[PDB]
């Protein structure tokens, strides 16, 4: 909760805010400040940072996806996109939009959403098919 | 209504059920030789799922089945394997009874011609005889059921099985002489696959031949019956078309089915001559070939009619073969329908020029289709040229087989008139 990162030039001020999900804080360098940057005081902000030990990093950002193609020949395959919810307290809705360029003829009766090993029926389903 | 036909049926359904429950069923259903964009179970299920989603099945390039198919498999979606067993059994039954009646008619004509002695004296082992025609209907049903083409078409759950059942019932009703049911089944088949329209010419002829109506210009009765049958056929077709409109309340099945059959926009590989030709075709100059290749199917109907006027069942067989070979998106179950007619014409097995080599070519091509398909789709070892060459060889074999049968038939007729 203390011991921020070390930046060599003393910053103008510090701005602490909830930016995406976490209360993160920034050092501010106001370029419209003749104290920070003169006509002959060019500013080279330095940041001491290296990949932190695994017991010191944020876990995962509560949501990520990974799309890939199943099957191995031609003439057939599967567009599958894993999407992860790493929050161990809260289900949340996710709107997935897919565009497939009409030379991978999709079979929408094969659309499965497991989400636990069970089957997850989407709350809202919209599908426009492709005209060659 | 037969002692061994029931055994044939039980063996056929046993084989088909074993294949359905085996692990080869998925592979067979994904086979591209037995499944076309027009006759795909996966596509039928896709259209039903689109209806479940509320989007029209024809607002896309994946579904091309008819509204009657939609209606039928809406209710029989769960019993599909049993439905396909039933429809192949119905095809076999219709072919059995049609060929039985046709053999009876043929022997009657041969007797009525031997009475007035229009044959040459040098004809003894050249006339159809009741002991050699006793098992012809059974062999017809046997070729229809117990050949790999129909078995694969059933296991893949292709609607080409439904098309075959409709065409076989058209043959049965025409042979029995039911002009109304003939027109209904011909309209259903034309509504399904768009290339039984040519079969309108043989059936009518046989119908006239069954009514002893002369087929000649200065004959009022011939024109009366032709107009009656044509109006029944066209009226049945238009009623089915309007009903199919009312199923979805839109004329979207019309383009997506018939213009899909006629314009060939899919280029999915087949056993036919269209896919690769139209994949590797020049942009301009391509509509001319669509036109000529569609005219090909309808081209021989009139000349074969005016050459086989007195033989409308052989003419019907040749027409079915021409449709099967020249066709947008043909499955190998379309080949089975005319191959089931071979025992009807096995008495021509002394004038067949080259049957051995053609049968070998067809068998080798049939067993090379999956092999080379694997070699350029799943293995990168081959390319599309291998499959194209196998399609060319298969279709040339089919043409030469049909031409050999037609030549043998004409030669047998000539030897019936002139001594050998
Ligand atoms: C009707 C029967 C045969 C039909 C055509 C056969 O020939 C086509 C294929 C060639 O297969 P491929 O794709 O490996 O080879 C090529 C390339 O890879 C490439 O990149 C090129 O640029 C090429 O030009 C090229 O060869 C060619 O163009 C072929 C030139 C021959 C034309 C004759 C007038 O034959 C067979 O394999 C099947 C064996 C036939 C019997 C089962
Ligand atoms: C830069 O600006 C401020 C005030 O002018 C101060 O840090 C210093 O006097 C200036 N010059 C340099 C070289 O830092």
Curated annotation (Swiss-Prot), chain A:
The record's account of how the chain is modified after translation: The disulfide bond between PIGK/GPI8 and PIGT is important for normal enzyme activity.
Top-level taxon: Eukaryota
Location(s), subcellular: Endoplasmic reticulum membrane
Impact noted for substituting residue 38 to Q: No effect on function in GPI-anchor attachment to protein
Glycan-linked positions: 2, 38
Biological function: Component of the glycosylphosphatidylinositol-anchor (GPI-anchor) transamidase (GPI-T) complex that catalyzes the formation of the linkage between a proprotein and a GPI-anchor and participates in GPI anchored protein biosynthesis. May play a crucial role in GPI-T complex assembly in the luminal layer. Binds GPI-anchor.
Family, per entry: Belongs to the PIGT family.
Protein name, entry field: GPI-anchor transamidase component PIGT
Naturally occurring in which organism (per UniProt): Homo sapiens
Gene behind the chain: PIGT
Shown stretch of the complete protein: 290 to 421 of 578
Curated annotation (Swiss-Prot), chain B:
Consequence the record notes for mutating residue 67 to A: No effect on function in GPI-anchor attachment to protein
Effect of residue 150 to A: No effect on function in GPI-anchor attachment to protein
UniProt effect for mutating residue 285 to A: No effect on function in GPI-anchor attachment to protein
Any one Gene Ontology molecular-function term assigned to this protein's record: GPI-anchor transamidase activity
Disulfide pattern: none
Keywords linked to the UniProt accession: Disease variant, Endoplasmic reticulum, Epilepsy, GPI-anchor biosynthesis, Intellectual disability, Membrane, Transmembrane, Transmembrane helix
Pathway: Glycolipid biosynthesis; glycosylphosphatidylinositol-anchor biosynthesis
Mode of membrane association: Multi-pass membrane protein
The organism's place on the tree of life at top rank: Eukaryota
UniProt GO BP: attachment of GPI anchor to protein; GPI anchor biosynthetic process; GPI anchored protein biosynthesis; regulation of receptor signaling pathway via JAK-STAT
One Pfam family cited in the UniProt record for this chain: PIG-U
Residues noted as binding a 2-acyl-6-[6-phosphoethanolamine-alpha-D-mannosyl-(1->2)-6-phosphoethanolamine-alpha-D-mannosyl-(1->6)-2-phosphoethanolamine-alpha-D-mannosyl-(1->4)-alpha-D-glucosaminyl]-1-(1-radyl,2-acyl-sn-glycero-3-phospho)-1D-myo-inositol in the record, renumbered to the chain: 383, 385
Disease: Neurodevelopmental disorder with brain anomalies, seizures, and scoliosis: An autosomal recessive disorder characterized by global developmental delay, severe-to-profound intellectual disability, muscular hypotonia, seizures, brain anomalies, including thin corpus callosum and cerebellar atrophy, scoliosis, and mild facial dysmorphism.
Entry's family note: Belongs to the PIGU family.
Quaternary state and interactors: Heteropentamer. Part of the GPI-anchor transamidase complex, consisting of PIGK, PIGT, PIGS, PIGU and GAA1.
Name this protein carries in UniProt: GPI-anchor transamidase component PIGU
Organism: Homo sapiens (Human)
Designated gene of the protein: PIGU
């Amino acid at each position: 909760d203390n011991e921020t990162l070390e930046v060599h030039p003393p910053p103008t001020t510090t701005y602490q805010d909830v930016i995406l999900g976490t209360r993160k804080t920034y050092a501010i360098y106001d370029l419209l400040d003749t104290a920070m940057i003169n006509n002959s005081r060019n500013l080279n902000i330095q940041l001491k940072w290296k990949r932190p030990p695994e017991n010191e990093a944020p876990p995962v950002p509560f949501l990520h996806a990974q799309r890939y193609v199943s099957g191995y020949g031609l003439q057939k395959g599967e567009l599958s996109t894993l999407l992860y919810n790493t929050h161990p307290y809260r289900a949340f809705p996710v709107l997935l939009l897919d565009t497939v360029p009409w030379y991978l003829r999709l079979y929408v009766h094969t659309l499965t959403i497991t989400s636990k090993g069970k089957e997850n029926k989407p709350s809202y389903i919209h599908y426009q098919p492709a005209q060659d | 209504m037969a002692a061994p036909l029931v055994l044939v049926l039980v063996v056929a359904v046993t084989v088909r059920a074993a294949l359905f429950r085996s692990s080869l069923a998925e592979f067979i259903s994904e086979r591209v030789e037995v499944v076309s964009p027009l006759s795909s179970w996966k596509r039928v299920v896709e259209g039903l799922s689109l209806l479940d989603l509320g989007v029209s099945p024809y607002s896309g390039a994946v579904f091309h089945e008819t509204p009657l198919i939609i209606y039928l498999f809406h209710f029989l979606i769960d019993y599909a394997e049993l439905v396909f067993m039933i429809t192949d059994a119905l095809t076999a039954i219709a072919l059995y009874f049609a060929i039985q009646d046709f053999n009876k008619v043929v022997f009657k004509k041969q007797k009525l011609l031997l009475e007035l002695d229009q044959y040459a004296p040098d004809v003894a082992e050249l006339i159809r005889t009741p002991m050699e025609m006793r098992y012809i209907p059974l062999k017809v049903a046997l070729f229809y059921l117990l050949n790999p083409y129909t078995i694969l078409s059933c296991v893949a759950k292709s609607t080409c099985a439904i098309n075959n059942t409709l065409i076989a019932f058209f043959i049965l009703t025409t042979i029995k002489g039911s002009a109304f049911l003939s027109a209904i089944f011909l309209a259903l088949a034309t509504y399904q696959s768009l290339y039984p329209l040519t079969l309108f010419v043989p059936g009518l002829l046989y119908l006239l031949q069954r009514q002893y109506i002369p087929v000649k210009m200065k004959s009022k009765a011939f024109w009366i019956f032709s107009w009656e049958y044509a109006m029944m056929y066209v009226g049945s077709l238009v009623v089915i078309i309007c009903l199919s409109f009312f199923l979805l309340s839109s004329w979207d099945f019309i383009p997506a089915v018939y213009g899909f059959i006629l314009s060939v926009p899919d280029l999915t590989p087949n056993i036919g001559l269209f896919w690769y030709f139209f994949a590797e075709m020049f942009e301009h100059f391509s509509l001319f070939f669509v036109c000529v290749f569609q005219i090909n199917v309808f081209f021989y109907t009139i000349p074969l009619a005016i050459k086989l006027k007195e033989h409308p069942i052989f003419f019907m067989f040749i027409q079915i073969a021409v449709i099967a070979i020249f066709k947008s998106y043909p499955t190998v179950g379309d080949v089975a329908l005319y191959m089931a007619f071979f025992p009807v014409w096995n008495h021509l097995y002394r004038f067949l020029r080259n049957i051995f080599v053609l049968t070998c070519i067809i068998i080798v091509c049939s067993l090379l289709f999956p092999v080379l398909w694997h070699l350029w789709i799943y293995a990168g070892s081959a390319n599309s040229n291998f499959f194209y060459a196998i399609t060319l060889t298969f279709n040339v074999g089919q043409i030469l087989l049909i031409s050999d049968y037609f030549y043998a038939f004409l030669r047998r007729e000539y030897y019936l008139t002139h001594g050998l």
